[PDB]
Amino acid sequence: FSTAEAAGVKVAAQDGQSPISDLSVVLRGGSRYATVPGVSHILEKFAFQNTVPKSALRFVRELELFGGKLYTHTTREHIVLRTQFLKQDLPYFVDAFANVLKETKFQQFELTERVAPVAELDLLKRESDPAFTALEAAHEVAFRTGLGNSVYAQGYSPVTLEDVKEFARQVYAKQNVAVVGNNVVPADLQQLVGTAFADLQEGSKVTQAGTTTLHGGEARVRTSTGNALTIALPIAEPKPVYHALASFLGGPASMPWSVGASPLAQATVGTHTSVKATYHNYGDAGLFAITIKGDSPAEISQVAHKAVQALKDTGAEVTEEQAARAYAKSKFAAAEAFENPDSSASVIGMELLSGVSRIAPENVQKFTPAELSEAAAQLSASAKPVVAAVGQVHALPFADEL
Amino acid sequence: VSPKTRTSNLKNGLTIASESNPLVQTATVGVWIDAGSRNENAYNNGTAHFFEHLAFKGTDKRSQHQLELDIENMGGHLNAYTSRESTVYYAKSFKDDVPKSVEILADILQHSKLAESAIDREREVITRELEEVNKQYEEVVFDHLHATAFMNQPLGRTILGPRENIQTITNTELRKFITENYTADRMVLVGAGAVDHDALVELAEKYFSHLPSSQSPVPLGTPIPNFVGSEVRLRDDTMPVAHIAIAVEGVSWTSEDYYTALVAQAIIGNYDRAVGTSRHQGSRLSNIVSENNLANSFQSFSTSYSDTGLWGIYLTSENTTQIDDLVHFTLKEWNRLSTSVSNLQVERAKSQLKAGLLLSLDGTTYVAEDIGRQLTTLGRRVTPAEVEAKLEAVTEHDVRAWAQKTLYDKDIALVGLGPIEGLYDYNRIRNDMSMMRW
């Protein structure tokens, strides 16, 4: 991805050999920047509504003539708006993104009838998975605000049209916009972005109101629709070793109808439970999480004990074999993330909008058994462990039990 | 313009097909087999699915545990699925982990233990799978749909097989199945992503050279299905959403009408209330359904097999007092493919498909699945230029002619699941397959 600049907008493109181009606008407008709770989810869902040049309806009917597709999502860091189309139709898509950023009519009826209902269905679909709820709850405990803000709009805290219009006034600005083109000729994109995004405000860099503070604790989301438990450990200094540790501890199986050879996978034997270690770098803090879902609260509890033991055991000693297995699993994970268009866009988006140069999958560091065990030891000896339980919360573990 | 799909054979008759992409760092190699549940009889129905479980239960060299470790150490993953007509076993890995993955695949396919102890263990696992598919409503609906459309025929059997068979599958019949079916002339070794074709051909000569050939080598994608218009109702008043499928007999992979059926399907298209754009879609049925809140979703499908297909729509709705309207409106939109469609709808649908067929291929596993599917159903990979020409040849006249012979006044297979009290009886549904005004 050749990084350049066109009329104050950072543009990154990589030409390829396919008939399919993906153009993604990455906005510095994720939930950690949200002025009011849920506004970044709402702004994402307000993309490709009525603009002054072109109605939502006309856009959709024309996008069907090109056979393009539209994908949007909100993270804690970004809003990503992606379009997938045939190579030749690039000018249309550039101009459509320009209309969205310059000329969205944020009309109250769109919010009431179109945007808000869809944002609510989006959330209900995600929450069908109790593990999603558990990991969301864990971020809320760990960070409180900023990273602790909910990503998604909730019913209890309503976003108004003034809220969304204000946030968009900050976000839709040259300083907060990056364009990423997969299988787009880089010289052609610079020319088009340079003409289309010339009239966009400059604005200023959107910032997190307040510094990231870490806290420990418990969250107990009582649902009737499945059981899960996250054990998170807030990290004050995000380091690349936690990727290797997440992949080492593992949890998912690498083979059908198997349990797996990872420590966390081996913790689930004899139970219909699944487990997954994940590490989330957010630049200035991180979260290392182990999430366990299952149907039985008794089995979840049983696994959760084994899971914390596994982390402590890792803090003791890692073998050379296990350290190499971690390097392999981690290189692979980095590669497939850079391939998946959703994650790809946000990776280069971070590079463009911040200045965190992307780590190529071929440059993923090999961590020795010493470095891995040291990282696991710091986690086992954290002053601020977080636990989010979801489901039959009366029967799930507590932080002081673990 | 995508890189060329290279294709080679071995001596035994194994096809090797590859499409390299120097932009990615991962590779998907795997084996596509022209064999699946359809190859069983009634006594060993469930064998193919049973084997898929045992393939990962240990080989003559590596034990179950060694297998697990070997794959974990590769870094990537292995995956498998058995359908009615097709079995796949693939391995996604890193670029330089391709020789390991080919070796593991060749091992689990040719040299599996199938130990009585593991047969006995999986026999419970698979028994439990019978009582948990129950939750996957779409799958429940489509499995009953095949059962009824192809009543007492091979395509009508499920993949899991009956409970009774699961209890009586022996290692002998497992062995017999994979010896008769997993032959070189029925198999394609596929690589997509960061693979060299010539490297993959060498790996095939190293691992898959001692594969048995079948006595009578037919071409890839070689097959008599007699559709039964019929209905299955699984009423469940406790469910909040009704799931309904309606299908007619569709087209096979090699039908002359294959593209005509795709264009017809695209005229009705899909709808989902949870997607933002769906309220704006051009499809007439989409507009009727969205304006009236008749459904949560619908998905048109055109499923093909070697000698038949099912073409139809799958609907989900919470509007339980207006199911009659939902079905009424849907069938009347089908009627118009026979009576009313013009260049307006046909050209719109063609435009949407010309991109759609190419868009779908957006990662190495999708590319591999495309190469594998096409090679095992058509015997060749169809280039985008040929596909563009086949689509361009579809006219409004072709769509009308096809609909009048396939849809108009034809028997349907109908499956309803959930609160379907308001779905009328077979006759009134089937009467909507024609228009008295035409």
Added chain:
Amino acid sequence: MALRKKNSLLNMANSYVLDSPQPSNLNYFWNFGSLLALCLVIQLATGITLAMHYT
């Protein structure tokens, strides 16, 4: 929504002669109702006609 259900007049017809939900096991002795309606129609048509010629 289907016209036969939407339009109030058509809906009254619909509710009696088309969508009307019936037990699925009525035997032929449930057919006298419609025969009585037929006799009543025949009597009306023939009766009105005889009235055109009767003094």
Added chain:
Amino acid sequence: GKSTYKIPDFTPYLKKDRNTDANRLFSYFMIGSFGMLSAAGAKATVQDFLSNMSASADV
């Protein structure tokens, strides 16, 4: 008795040639014949009946 994917036996009733045009055509011939006689009977009924209104034999 238990599996709902095992369709009950319909062989006593299923026609082997069910998807053929000849099969449909036959049943439409029956429906059509019935419509034909109903049309011819209606015409005869209406013509004979309404003729009562034409000038009577005494006129």
Added chain:
Amino acid sequence: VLPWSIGVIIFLLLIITAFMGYVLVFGQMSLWGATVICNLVSAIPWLGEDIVHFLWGGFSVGNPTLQRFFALHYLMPFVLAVFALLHLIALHTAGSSNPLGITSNVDKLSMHPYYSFKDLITVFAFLLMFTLFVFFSPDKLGHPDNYIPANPMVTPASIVPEWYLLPFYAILRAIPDKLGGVIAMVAAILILLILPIVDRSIIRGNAFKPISKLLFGFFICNFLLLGVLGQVHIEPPFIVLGQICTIFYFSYFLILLPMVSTIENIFFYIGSL
């Protein structure tokens, strides 16, 4: 639109019912009216004459005609009552309109007791008018010729319909052609069916539309003039006047209402800016 359209058919049934009832007296007006009105059917091309003989049940209006009109006059009021009930059932979806032309959904009253007791006032007003005609002037609205027994030989001085059919008779006389005249006469009733289309106003009703109110006044008075011209002799200068009034009748539907309603739309918008 549906209660209105059914209404137009109720009005046609009433015309036929009352026409046939008038024949049953079998006085001179009964016979001669039946003769000339039934002869209009002879205008239907090709089969017209055959249809007339079929209606009459013979070669002229006589006993067969009288007996069949009795049977039909008995029946038609039942048909009329059914259609009257249908137009009400159709109306019940929207409810009654109101003299402001706005929604009433905001402020409803029970039909009883308020409209029940209000209907009593006009019932008693009606009964007073009824009483004055029935008891004190029973013959004022009638034609003396109907007290002469029907005589097919002697033709009365002037054969006119009952007063309520006179405007349609004037419209028929205005067109010189027989078939033309019949078409125009029927069109004068069926043209009511296009009001929903030709009225282009964004506002329902005339309470607030000064120009439409004036045009309505002229239309109503022209319909009364047509009525009067239906009973004059076919002589100058009433021949030309009949034609002008007929033109005005049709041009209300076809020209003036579409023009006036379009202009008032513009005046409401600009006038309130």
Added chain:
Amino acid sequence: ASITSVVKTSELILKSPLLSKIVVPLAKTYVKFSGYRQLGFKMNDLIIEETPNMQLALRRLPPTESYDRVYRLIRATQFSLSHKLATGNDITKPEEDDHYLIPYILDVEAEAFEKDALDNLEVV
């Protein structure tokens, strides 16, 4: 007729100097003789609402505007049934006769008419 039609034609007239010079004073007198202000209505209260489009535009009014419309209709209905006219503050002054609904219905209709156009698009 559509509000769209009415609004477009009115704009053509207001543009032409000659046309406006002769039409605008007539329209003002027309409205004075109309006399809907004497029942405390605003012009837009009189537009026919029993239409899918108009129902949608009414739903999109801000709650305040909506509540006040309900009051005007009820008050006018009460004057009508009493055979009285508005007096004093109930009379709508020309400055209060604002087109509160026109923007809503024009947007509803814009979409409805775009939908009809796009349902007839022909790939070239």
Added chain:
Amino acid sequence: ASITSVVKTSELILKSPLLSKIVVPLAKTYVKFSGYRQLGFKMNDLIIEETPNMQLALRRLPPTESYDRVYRLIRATQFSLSHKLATGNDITKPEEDDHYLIPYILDVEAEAFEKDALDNLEVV
């Protein structure tokens, strides 16, 4: 007549030795000739349910009993329309003809009749 009535009178007969000796064999043959078991019904499936009391008792059936009742009625309706009888396992055997509903309706009626009595109480 009320289920309560029927049940009380039956209990009077079953108490009297003489009465039971002559009535019980008749009742058994009556039921054999009745032939509801040949349609796979249980006796209680035939009780009239379009009464408030019976609606209440049916709502109080345990879900399993309720689901099975629905199946018996549907199956019997299909035999009726086909003019076939039950065969094999579909025939209700005398041991399966259990009074599943009687306890529920007797409780519903108990309360309904107590209510009527107490609505007519007179302080003495």
